[PDB]
Design a protein around this motif. Sequence first.
Motif, PDB file in Angstrom:
ATOM      1  N   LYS B 270      40.683  49.554  37.828  1.00 14.53           N
ATOM      2  CA  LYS B 270      41.826  50.426  37.591  1.00 14.53           C
ATOM      3  C   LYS B 270      42.799  50.396  38.760  1.00 14.53           C
ATOM      4  O   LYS B 270      44.012  50.372  38.555  1.00 14.53           O
ATOM      5  CB  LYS B 270      41.360  51.854  37.310  1.00 14.53           C
ATOM      6  N   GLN B 271      42.279  50.379  39.985  1.00 12.66           N
ATOM      7  CA  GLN B 271      43.146  50.318  41.155  1.00 12.66           C
ATOM      8  C   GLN B 271      43.927  49.010  41.174  1.00 12.66           C
ATOM      9  O   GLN B 271      45.117  48.994  41.489  1.00 12.66           O
ATOM     10  CB  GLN B 271      42.324  50.452  42.436  1.00 12.66           C
ATOM     11  N   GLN B 272      43.268  47.919  40.801  1.00 16.59           N
ATOM     12  CA  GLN B 272      43.934  46.624  40.741  1.00 16.59           C
ATOM     13  C   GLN B 272      45.092  46.657  39.742  1.00 16.59           C
ATOM     14  O   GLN B 272      46.150  46.062  39.977  1.00 16.59           O
ATOM     15  CB  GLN B 272      42.940  45.525  40.353  1.00 16.59           C
ATOM     16  N   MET B 273      44.889  47.359  38.626  1.00 17.75           N
ATOM     17  CA  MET B 273      45.919  47.491  37.599  1.00 17.75           C
ATOM     18  C   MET B 273      47.098  48.310  38.113  1.00 17.75           C
ATOM     19  O   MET B 273      48.257  47.921  37.959  1.00 17.75           O
ATOM     20  CB  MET B 273      45.357  48.184  36.354  1.00 17.75           C
ATOM     21  N   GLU B 274      46.796  49.447  38.739  1.00 14.94           N
ATOM     22  CA  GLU B 274      47.827  50.357  39.232  1.00 14.94           C
ATOM     23  C   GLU B 274      48.674  49.712  40.316  1.00 14.94           C
ATOM     24  O   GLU B 274      49.878  49.956  40.403  1.00 14.94           O
ATOM     25  CB  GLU B 274      47.204  51.650  39.766  1.00 14.94           C
ATOM     26  N   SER B 275      48.048  48.863  41.124  1.00 22.36           N
ATOM     27  CA  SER B 275      48.728  48.164  42.204  1.00 22.36           C
ATOM     28  C   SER B 275      49.709  47.115  41.688  1.00 22.36           C
ATOM     29  O   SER B 275      50.505  46.576  42.459  1.00 22.36           O
ATOM     30  CB  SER B 275      47.712  47.513  43.122  1.00 22.36           C
ATOM     31  N   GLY B 276      49.647  46.811  40.392  1.00 19.92           N
ATOM     32  CA  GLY B 276      50.542  45.831  39.793  1.00 19.92           C
ATOM     33  C   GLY B 276      50.119  44.402  40.097  1.00 19.92           C
ATOM     34  O   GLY B 276      50.961  43.509  40.195  1.00 19.92           O
ATOM     35  N   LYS B 277      48.818  44.184  40.258  1.00 19.27           N
ATOM     36  CA  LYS B 277      48.314  42.856  40.567  1.00 19.27           C
ATOM     37  C   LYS B 277      48.331  41.964  39.334  1.00 19.27           C
ATOM     38  O   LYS B 277      48.289  42.447  38.202  1.00 19.27           O
ATOM     39  CB  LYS B 277      46.899  42.935  41.142  1.00 19.27           C
ATOM     40  N   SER B 278      48.393  40.655  39.570  1.00 21.11           N
ATOM     41  CA  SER B 278      48.411  39.638  38.519  1.00 21.11           C
ATOM     42  C   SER B 278      47.082  39.526  37.788  1.00 21.11           C
ATOM     43  O   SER B 278      46.996  38.900  36.732  1.00 21.11           O
ATOM     44  CB  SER B 278      48.735  38.294  39.129  1.00 21.11           C
ATOM     45  N   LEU B 279      46.045  40.110  38.376  1.00 23.27           N
ATOM     46  CA  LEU B 279      44.687  40.067  37.848  1.00 23.27           C
ATOM     47  C   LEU B 279      44.107  38.659  37.907  1.00 23.27           C
ATOM     48  O   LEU B 279      43.171  38.330  37.181  1.00 23.27           O
ATOM     49  CB  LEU B 279      44.651  40.571  36.396  1.00 23.27           C
ATOM     50  N   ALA B 280      44.621  37.841  38.823  1.00 22.48           N
ATOM     51  CA  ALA B 280      44.062  36.512  39.037  1.00 22.48           C
ATOM     52  C   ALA B 280      42.808  36.631  39.891  1.00 22.48           C
ATOM     53  O   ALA B 280      42.779  36.226  41.050  1.00 22.48           O
ATOM     54  CB  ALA B 280      45.084  35.607  39.711  1.00 22.48           C
ATOM     55  N   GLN B 281      41.786  37.233  39.296  1.00 21.15           N
ATOM     56  CA  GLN B 281      40.538  37.545  39.977  1.00 21.15           C
ATOM     57  C   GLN B 281      39.341  37.355  39.058  1.00 21.15           C
ATOM     58  O   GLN B 281      39.416  37.613  37.861  1.00 21.15           O
ATOM     59  CB  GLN B 281      40.565  38.985  40.484  1.00 21.15           C
ATOM     60  N   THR B 282      38.229  36.928  39.632  1.00 18.16           N
ATOM     61  CA  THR B 282      36.987  36.800  38.882  1.00 18.16           C
ATOM     62  C   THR B 282      35.913  37.650  39.545  1.00 18.16           C
ATOM     63  O   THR B 282      35.195  37.176  40.425  1.00 18.16           O
ATOM     64  CB  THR B 282      36.538  35.334  38.807  1.00 18.16           C
ATOM     65  N   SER B 283      35.859  38.918  39.142  1.00 21.39           N
ATOM     66  CA  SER B 283      35.030  39.952  39.761  1.00 21.39           C
ATOM     67  C   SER B 283      33.529  39.679  39.650  1.00 21.39           C
ATOM     68  O   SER B 283      33.069  39.165  38.634  1.00 21.39           O
ATOM     69  CB  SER B 283      35.339  41.284  39.107  1.00 21.39           C
ATOM     70  N   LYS B 284      32.769  40.072  40.688  1.00 16.43           N
ATOM     71  CA  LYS B 284      31.306  39.959  40.721  1.00 16.43           C
ATOM     72  C   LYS B 284      30.694  41.245  41.253  1.00 16.43           C
ATOM     73  O   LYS B 284      29.484  41.465  41.148  1.00 16.43           O
ATOM     74  CB  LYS B 284      30.859  38.759  41.590  1.00 16.43           C
TER      75      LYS B 284
END
Lengths: 416, 420
Positions: B270-284
Amino acid sequence: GLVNQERTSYLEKKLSCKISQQIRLELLKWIEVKAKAKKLQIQPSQLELFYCLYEMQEEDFVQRAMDYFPKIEINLSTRMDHMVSSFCIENCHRVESLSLGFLHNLTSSFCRGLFSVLSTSQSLTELDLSDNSLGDPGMRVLCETLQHPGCNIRRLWLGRCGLSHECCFDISLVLSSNQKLVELDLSDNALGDFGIRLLCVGLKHLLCNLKKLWLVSCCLTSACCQDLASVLSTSHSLTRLYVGENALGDSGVAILCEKAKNPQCNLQKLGLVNSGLTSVCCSALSSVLSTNQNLTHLYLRGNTLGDKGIKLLCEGLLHPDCKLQVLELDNCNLTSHCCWDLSTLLTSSQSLRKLSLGNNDLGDLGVMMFCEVLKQQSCLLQNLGLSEMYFNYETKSALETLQEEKPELTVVFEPS
Amino acid sequence: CKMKKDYRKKYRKYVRSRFQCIEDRNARLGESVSLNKRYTRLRLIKESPIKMELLFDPDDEHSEPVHTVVFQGAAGIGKTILARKMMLDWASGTLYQDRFDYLFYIHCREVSLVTQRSLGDLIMSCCPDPNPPIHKIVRKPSRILFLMDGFDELQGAFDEHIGPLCTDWQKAERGDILLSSLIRKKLLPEASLLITTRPVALEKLQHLLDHPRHVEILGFSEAKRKEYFFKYFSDEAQARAAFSLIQENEVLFTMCFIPLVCWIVCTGLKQQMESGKSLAQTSKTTTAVYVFFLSSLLQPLCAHLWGLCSLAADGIWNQKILFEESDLRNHGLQKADVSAFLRMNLFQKEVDCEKFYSFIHMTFQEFFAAMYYLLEEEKEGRTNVPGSRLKLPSRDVTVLLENYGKFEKGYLIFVVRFLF
């Protein structure tokens, strides 16, 4: 309490007399209004009027005020409540029905002083003791009082009283002595097969005039049918037998049918509702319907009889000697393939008046066929059921049309 | 005269009819049947895993009946589904069939705390019949269970300190008092009560219970995790994107079986979304999740991270999962600081028969230990602490790396991965 007559001197006469008479009349009117206004409210909830009468221990008044209570429904929380209701109920000659909501009392002689009053009433006809903790030890006390020569109770609704087999012995003693009891409801208890073996001791007894017996959901199995069947055969008065919501499967019904098929049997209504029946026993039910001309109501809902069951029942229902008027077939696991046989009943059975088809996937096309045949001078003028059964537009239109074109038909009773 | 019918059966039918679906409302894809059979059974833990059955039964000793049970879980779980499903399972005769004759639904979002009324909730939750047998088994306690769906969702001020006990169901009183009377077991004594609520309202609830049986979410099922993500994120577009980010990574999902962890990863995403990030991430990228989580957790304390990071560094180097209060004090993380981080759910007190403190997950201990090497401003509070000089194990990354191939040092594998 103060508005009284039976008092002495010694300054007890410093109270008014003319005013005391005026208040006595006003208090009587107050009771009349509240007694008649029998609804949920924060005004005197029946028993509260009894508390008032209890203090006014003047039989000439109490027996008069109590004539405004044709129906009494009270909830007793303690000993004082029994003392109060006992006094008022005893001093009442116009009560037809009484309901006793025993609370956190029961399984004791605690209430004996009340039951001994009910058994002396000459107007009480219906006694409702359902839905309370009137466990076996409490039922014994009642059974002792139900044997009173002047009991006069005809309808005893011992529903969810938490009774088991132990009470059946005491009940049988009542049945073999009390010639006034007509309707007995022992449903939603634990009167298992053994309880029935004991109960049937009274049911088969001479002078047992019981007409209506409910044994619904009493943890019964087919094992008890051997005794119930004997009651149906021998009893001169039992006409209404309800034994559904039990494990009286096909093998149980076959036993009941073996005796119920006897043309001299007095059975009129057979409540084999959720008995877990299959088409296997429908040939037995058919035999009963065909031979027993006294059977007018048969309730089979909840029985997964299917289409095969309907075909077998029709062999009896369409028989010229069948007098069945009401047949209930709700959740019987029927489908559209039985519509030809149901349709046959709709016009060919001249005795049938009601047919409560219900929660089964019968098919809307099948129902439209019913409409077409019913119009052909059918005598099936009572509710056609079809409740909880959903149909397309054309079918619903046909059903609405049927009611308009065949106005002698009481009701279709569609769900929407 | 009297209607001789088993109203409890009529009530059960009404409940089965009323609670057929998840919502039982329109706009559900053309008001279709949601098919509650899709529900995944929720695993519960006694504050010791338990079943839905035996919930109100006495435990191994005492033989004391449990009148009130309280259900706890993370925001986004769908606590209302549990409350509603239980009534359906009951109405169908599968859940508590031999324990309760009636279950009464109390929707805390509908209940008015200001409104003065008798206990008509017993009537309002009944079938359409305006005159139910309120004086029969509906009145008799011990066979009645009330379900407080959304205690935390009660609208308006609610006081746990109430003068009147509002006894006698036929007497009208304020909704807040009336609810507390049921909670305190003053109204309809020996009646059972089941409460579903978020942790946020437990502080004002426990005061009314004294000795409840507290129950919290084993963890989530695979389906439960999915539902959590879709409900946690109010924007379905973000719910899908956040779910996709985790969906690629099986490892993160496995740890997300823990209700707390699922909340944590959702929070980080959610924080990543609010920050306006591109979401170019592969979470672990387990690190990225925990970093985003702490950003949103601590931003609303942040100057006291050093203490717990030092604690973590000690944890990994000495193979210590369970910390003494002496360690919390020695690392300069005590009292006010410990409470701050416990409130900012990041730590456990190991309340399950233990006297030690610990991290909510082994990966957090490793994560913070990695931060320890990177932490910056300069504070003397780490040297003036009563436990000084501290063994602050090193802050030497070379040593950390040299001991990579050493189980004797707690592997330190994840710690290095976290530094990366």
